[PDB]
Each structure stands twice: as structure tokens, then as C-alpha cells.
Amino acid sequence: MLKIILPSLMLLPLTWLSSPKKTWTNVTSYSFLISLTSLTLLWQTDENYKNFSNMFSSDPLSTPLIILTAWLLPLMLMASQNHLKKDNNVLQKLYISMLISLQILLIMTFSATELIMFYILFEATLIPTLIIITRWGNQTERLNAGIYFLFYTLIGSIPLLIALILIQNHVGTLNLMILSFTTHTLDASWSNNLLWLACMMAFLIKMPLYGVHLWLPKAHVEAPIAGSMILAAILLKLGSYGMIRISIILDPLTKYMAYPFILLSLWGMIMTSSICLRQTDLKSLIAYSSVSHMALVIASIMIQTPWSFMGATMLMIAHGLTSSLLFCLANSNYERIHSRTMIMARGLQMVFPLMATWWLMASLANLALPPSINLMGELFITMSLFSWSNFTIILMGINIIITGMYSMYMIITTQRGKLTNHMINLQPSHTRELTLMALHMIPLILLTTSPKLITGLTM
Amino acid sequence: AFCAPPAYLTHQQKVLRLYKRALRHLESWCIHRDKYRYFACLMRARFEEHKNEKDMMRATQLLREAEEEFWQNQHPQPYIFPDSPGGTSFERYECYKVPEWCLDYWHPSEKAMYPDYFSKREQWKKLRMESWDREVKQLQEETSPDGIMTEALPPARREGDLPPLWWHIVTRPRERPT
Amino acid sequence: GYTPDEKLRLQQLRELRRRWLKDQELSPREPVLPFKAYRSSLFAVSHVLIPMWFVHYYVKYHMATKPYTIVSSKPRIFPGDTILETGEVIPPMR
Amino acid sequence: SDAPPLTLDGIKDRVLYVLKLYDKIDPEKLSVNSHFMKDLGLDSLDQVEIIMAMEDEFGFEIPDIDAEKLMCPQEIVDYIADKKDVYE
């Protein structure tokens, strides 16, 4: 693992000790080499989970997340380039340093033998994402968005610390395979019910479902593109890796404590898909789309089917690549028009032919294409929830109706149409942006081709 | 389209609008041209009451009665044209309609692919930049200071100058391109 | 009717539109660029025969050597036939 | 499409060809620069009936806000030419 962690830590003198003309090319080329050396975790020739050291372990569910972190770092450092073409050198290198440090601690959070190391590097994300959002955000409400993000996640994460230290002083070591194998069943006690709520509330805030979903669209319309891609594509699902790894302690209580969170998840995903039908901001529309696609996997890990866990992990990496591509397209439209309203910029296919093709592929992976991992994960979650209850399929059917309607509503609004002709400043699409969405989409096509890597923890 | 609507439709304008809607919803109904010409001269045998009406309250009452008759006997699917709105080809050829600011963003390889046309477009842009500083001064002196301002733009009063607000009219793409 | 103030604008603008469309005409030198069923026989060699070679190599030697993937329906056996594989005859119908 | 483009003299000959086929138009009186109200003496219906003649002649729709203003064959030729966007 340390061949992935420590040269990512040695990317910091690559940022701070090079010429300011050459920071972007050296850091992007060596971070693509970080992703190439982070493809080494796929050497599972057996069901024995890879444990390189007592510090770090590799899991089959955690390895497409770990290639998505090391692959998401150069996709953020591409997209920050014309975002930071006017800022000066030490703020540019501080942005690259905060992005690289976020990548380092996300790699180290996904490689966690011990759950309190997971909590340390789980709450270590809350500083550099706040540095990205509340300094380089382009609107007024980024202070309120940073306060919302920071305090939603800390008021979730404080009883996670309480329940982790209580579980540790109850049973011994918080190592994940130790507490997988030596553990006992939990008695049906009300203190254990409050332990369930305390250890689950951090991940229940980090994955947005109703009651606690509201920090995500503020910290997506007030974020930059690298903060929005990290908060839409791996750092939101760091809590989903935690929600997967917590539940092995406490599986006997989930079959009666599961019901309000599946309820709030399903009615939150119907109402957030209904929210996205009438939205002005395109980044807010992709943000509430991420809320609905996270409420699906909130229901999927609140049930403990193995089928659900495969559909969960498939929805993790499909939602991360699809929402990262959609937010990159929203940043491209924001770069052209200096606004994020979908209504004011229509008919863009007449001037951008291939950006219409990447818009079509991103929103037609958001609308879940059948060989893609989006309908593969959603169909396996539909299988598991119909195994849970036979009357639940109308709710997710209404959700898939309105997700088709908001995806093709965003295509028909911002791509097809009359071509608004009051914009001279629709400059043609950059080679950066076209290869950035190509390096988003071509991993989704190869992941469609080989879905054996993405099967998760449980088959 | 090329002219401008008024603040209010007059009685003659509403009567001729009813005549136009009547003589297209007829031939939406009476499909054959013999029935169209017989019922169109029956519509002239219906206009002959409205010729010398002098009160104008009774003319607006007859306008309301004829409009209620038109909405009662109107076609559920009216006659539509390929170039009309609600039609077969209403803004069908918008794949062509990419305006003249997008030719500024062409590569120099594609600009050298068309030598003389870009030199003549440079001449048209020179005509724009030498006409605009007298075009925008013309509107601020032909603008009336009173509270009523019309929609129709003034022409070129000065000899040798272009009309004001000319580029968005003169550089629309063609409606039937190919 | 038509007022002459709008008529002068429309006359000058229609002259400018005729000038703009005659300028949008292309010059004759302006775009500068850098047998019977023989192509049908060439397509029948280069896109029928060689993909039949590739897909037939696939079907006979990567597919049919792996089991339970090319499974035929049972062909119909009638009273009066003789199956070549074991040499037996079917008894005739009544 | 397979339809030929329309010349100015062809459009003028087509507009004059429909306009001489009206019953209350003298073809020797009819020139291209003659006003419908004060030079051929027509009524309020006949101008919009000339507009319906151009509607079923040229296969496109003239709006009524332009069609009230159109009053003579020369700018009905120039309006039909500027709507179909012909270079001469």
C-alpha cells in the first residue's frame, strides 16, 4: 500500500519545488503514474483479503474506490487549470497541495485496518475540502456552504467517535477483521439502539438523505470543480465505505432499526428526483441527482443482502464517474457563460458537436443505460429490495421515471434547442476538456466491459 | 415578423384577423376548392353586414358574436403550413442556423480554406466598426423625450450612413438553406 | 398602410440583405483542399469473407471447445428415417 | 430540396400572374408600383385576400402584422424575397 501512499506524499515537493510553468504537467503526469501504480491492488487470486501491513489493508469493495481516488486526482488537476489561469503561483500550488493531500488521506482512509484510523482520516477530509470551497468558490454563499458542510459532518461524526470508543472499550481492538471474526451478537437493548444511531449518524449525514441532505447542494453550487468532483465522486462515498464496514459489528439490530432510514431514503429519492425537474442551477440539479443516487445506496446498505452490496458498490463507482463527468460538463458551461442557469444557455449542440456527445453519454449514463454500471447497480438494488419487500418497487419505479425525466430535461434544455445567439463568448471546446471527459467516460466503458473488478466485498 | 406589433389591436385589425382565421379554418374544413370558393363567397355574403356599421358598440358586439361563432365552428386541427408555427417544419432547419460570431472562432487552417469570403467579412466588420459610432448617436437624438416610445426603429436620415440596428436583421441565416 | 419612415429602413435593409447574400455566395476557386460491381466483390472479400474467417475461428476453436454454449435443439426424427450415428431405423407409423 | 431557387423577376412574374387573375383588377392598369387603396381602389378585404393568394401560392405563412402593412406588389415581392432569403 505504501507504494501508493508515500509517492503521493512525495508529490508535495513536486508541487512546491518545480517551476510555476511546469507544476501542472509534472503533477498531472506523475499522478497518472500514481493511478498506474495504484492499479496494483487487483491481484486477488483468492478470497483472502490483501493485508500489506498492520496499518493498511486492501479490500475487494475498497479497491475500485481506491482506483477512483487515484484516478480522480488527475481529473481534478486537469479541471482546475483554466479555473486557476488568472490566480498567482503560491495560491495555485496551495490548491494543488490541498488536492494532493486530500488524495493522500483518501487513499489512507480507504486502506484502513483499524476503524479509529478510519475515523482520523475520515475527519481529516474536513479541512482541505473546506479550503477548496470557501477560498476558491465564486459566489457569496460559500461561507454558509462551508459552515453547513463542516457542521453537518461534525455533528454526525462526534457520536461516531463516542460509539467507536465505547465499542473499543467494550470488546477490545477496533481492527476490522478482528472485529469481524471474534465478535458476538448484540442484545436487543436501548443503549445498543443508541449505539446504532451514534455509529450510523455520521454516514447517514455524509450520504445525503432527508432530514440531513441539505449540505450537499450548497457545497456543490458554492464549490469549485475539484471540490465538487471530490464531494460528488469519492468523499461522499468515504462514509459509504464506513457504513459498509460498521454494520458487521451490529447486524442483528439492523433488521429492526433499518426501517426509518430506508423510508426517508426512498421518499427522499422520489422528492429529490422531483426537485430536479424544476431547478434553475445545473450544478444544483446534478447535486440533488447525487442526493437521489445516494439515497438508493442508503437503502441498499441499510439492507444487508449480498446482492445489495454488489449493486451498492456498482452504484458507488458508476455514480462517482457519472456525476464527476456531469459536474465537469457543468463547469465547462460555467466556463463558457459565467453562470450556472440552464435556462439562459440553450442550444449548445449547434456550436459544440462532440461536447453534445459527452453530454449525451453523461446524462445517458445518469439515465441508467443497460450495459452500464448504473442500471447494473440499480437493478441489483431493485432485486434486493424486492427480496426485502414486494411493495417497494413502485417507489423506485417512480424514481427511475423522474430520473429519466430530469436527465433528458437537462439534455433538451442545455443541449438541444434554438441556439441562443446573444453569446459571442461561446469559445470552442478545449482539448483539455474533451480529453478530461474522455478520461472520465472511457473508464466507464472499460468498467462496463470488465465488471469483475467492481463486484464489491460480498461476491 | 419584420414589422412590429402595436400597443393595441384596432377594430379593423381584429376584424381582418377574424377574416384571416375564418378563411384558413375554411379550407381546413371545406377541403375541395369548389367548396372553398363557394363557402368563401358565402363568407363575403357574411361580411356585407359589417360594412357600414356606425355605432362601433354594435360592431364590437357583432365582432364578439362572429368570434363566438368562429370558436364554436372552428376546426380542431386547423390548416397549418410548413413554414408556419405549430407546423410541419417550424424551425426545422436550425442545424444550419449558427450565426456570424461563430466564424470568428475558426482555426486559421479553416480560414485559409476560404480566402476571399473572410476578406469580405473583414470588410463587413470594418463597415460595422465605422458605422456603429454614428448609429448609436442617431438613436439618442431621434429618441423622443416624451413618455411614448414606439417599437419601430428609425431609418438612415443621414445620407451615406447605414440604418440603425441593422446587423441582427441583415445577418440572420437563411430560412431555406439547402 | 406603409409609412415612408419604415419604407426607407426596409428598402435600405433589403438592399443590404441582397448585398450580404451576394457576398455569402462562394467563389469558384474558394474551397481549397489538400468498375461494375468490382467494389461489391471487394466488399464481399474484405468485409464478408475475412470476418467470417475470424468469427469462424472464434466459433470453432474458442467457443465450441468450451462446453454448453452452442447447444442445438433436437432435430426432428420421423417414422421412416435412419440416423447415421448409431444406424438404427425408426418403426413406421400405423 | 429539389425545388429551384426563386429569382426576383420570377417572383415578380408569379406575383403579377396571381394578381392579374383577380376579378376586380384591370391588367392594363396593374403595374408593379401601384397602391391597392388609392391607385387601384380596392377594399379592406381584398388586401388580405391578396395575402391568402400569396399563402396558397408560395406555400409559406405571412403574419397578419406584416400583411396589414403590405399594400402594393413591389414590396410584397420584396417581402416574399426577404422572407425566402434570395440573393437577387
Partner: peptide
């Protein structure tokens, strides 16, 4: 029948 210039965005990029 002389060819009219088709107007088109920059396909080089």
C-alpha cells in the same frame, strides 16, 4: 447553380 456558403462552427477543435 452557384454554391452558397454553408455556415458552420469550427470543427478543427
Amino acid at each position: 447553380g452557384k454554391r452558397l456558403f454553408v455556415v458552420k462552427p469550427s470543427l478543427y477543435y
